């Protein structure tokens, strides 16, 4: 029950990745081959930060227009089960 640092840079549609729940947010799904999947990301992951900001405590619909805002890559600290 792990914790893993996972950079996703921005790709040609978004980060490839879809949320699910409120505080504390996880990942539903990862796209097949997307931004998200190659760089480590996986269902069932616990987002507990995204870049500088802890988000343990964020709703969904929150989480979403943050990741979206974000320049160029984000940066999550989630909780995994391993």
Same mark, same amino acid.
């Given at each position: 029950?792990?914790?893993?640092?996972? =950079?996703?840079?921005?790709?040609?549609?978004?980060? #490839?990745? =879809?949320?699910?729940?409120?505080?504390?947010?996880?990942?539903?799904?990862?796209?097949? #081959?997307?931004?998200? +999947? %190659?760089?480590?990301?996986?269902?069932?992951? =616990?987002?507990?930060?995204?870049?500088?900001?802890?988000? +343990?405590?964020?709703?969904?619909? +929150?989480?979403?227009?943050?990741? %979206?805002?974000?320049?160029?890559?984000?940066?999550?600290?989630?909780? %995994?089960?391993?």
């Amino acid at each position: 029950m792990r914790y893993r640092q996972i =950079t996703i840079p921005r790709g040609k549609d978004g980060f #490839g990745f =879809t949320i699910c729940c409120d505080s504390p947010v996880r990942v539903q799904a990862v796209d097949s #081959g997307g931004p998200a +999947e %190659r760089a480590g990301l996986q269902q069932l992951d =616990t987002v507990l930060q995204l870049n500088e900001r802890p988000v +343990e405590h964020w709703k969904c619909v +929150e989480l979403a227009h943050e990741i %979206r805002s974000c320049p160029s890559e984000i940066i999550l600290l989630v909780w %995994r089960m391993v």
